[PDB]
Design a protein around this ligand. Sequence first.
Ligand SMILES: COC(=O)[C@@H]1C[C@@H](OS(N)(=O)=O)CN1S(=O)(=O)[C@@H]1O[C@@H](COC(C)=O)[C@@H](O)[C@@H](O)[C@H]1O
Ligand SMILES: [Zn+2]
Length: 257
Amino acid sequence: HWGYGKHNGPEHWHKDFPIAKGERQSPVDIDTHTAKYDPSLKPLSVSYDQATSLRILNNGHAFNVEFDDSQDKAVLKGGPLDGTYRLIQFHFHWGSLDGQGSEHTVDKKKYAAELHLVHWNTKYGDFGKAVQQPDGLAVLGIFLKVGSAKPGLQKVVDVLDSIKTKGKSADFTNFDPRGLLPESLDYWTYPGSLTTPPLLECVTWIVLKEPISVSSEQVLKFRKLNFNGEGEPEELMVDNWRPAQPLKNRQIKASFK
Ligand SMILES: COC(=O)[C@@H]1C[C@@H](OS(N)(=O)=O)CN1S(=O)(=O)[C@@H]1O[C@@H](COC(C)=O)[C@@H](O)[C@@H](O)[C@H]1O
Ligand SMILES: [Zn+2]
């Protein structure tokens, strides 16, 4: 089944997941001149001080850092959101080259990678119930460009050797995701979807305007990961991004003038 190759990639997904051609699919191009400032947007609240990371996993599509979401330890509130959304995991999408890798684009510009911090709406009790709801998830998206190193990313980078292939995991406790944020929390927001199968239309997207910088050495280590399992022919984990989808009947709102 699905992946990012020529024969199982994004242009094939609709055959197993017809919602791929739905009315609120992600990612999208963010046209900065068409996005409208919305003064009704409340300030974004990112409360990660009590975040409890557990594990990092290569699942054959990306690497995922998982959190304890059995209590309100790390939460996202405010902005366009009603209620409390619990951090469950984060992951990245990245390219084979610095000129591509992000899922969202900004005036058609592609960044080298994109970080997704996934949160679920606690009024639905668990993640599996939340993805069945139009306001079930809030994903915080952060662009990566190549320049100076991101110190808060390095602990992630240095563990990747231990999870090279699909199915491998490692202990990843006491990681502080606050070290992955840019200075500004200015954002764009729109209603959208998961960007991987099952492509469910359950996400409030919050995409930060300010990218973070990571070093060429850091993103090079992303690209040494493997889509395949151990003892299988090596396929480098690169270009695990879905391209921009039609905006259709949606307006992207900006938190800033
Ligand atoms: C809690 O886990 C999740 O939310 C993942 C990531 C999230 O991606 S994103 N691009 O839309 O923010 C999708 N879901 S998911 O539907 O639960 C999760 O994701 C997939 C791949 O996703 C990645 C990035 O590796 C699959 O393997 C899949 O079986 C799904 O259950
Ligand atoms: Zn993602």
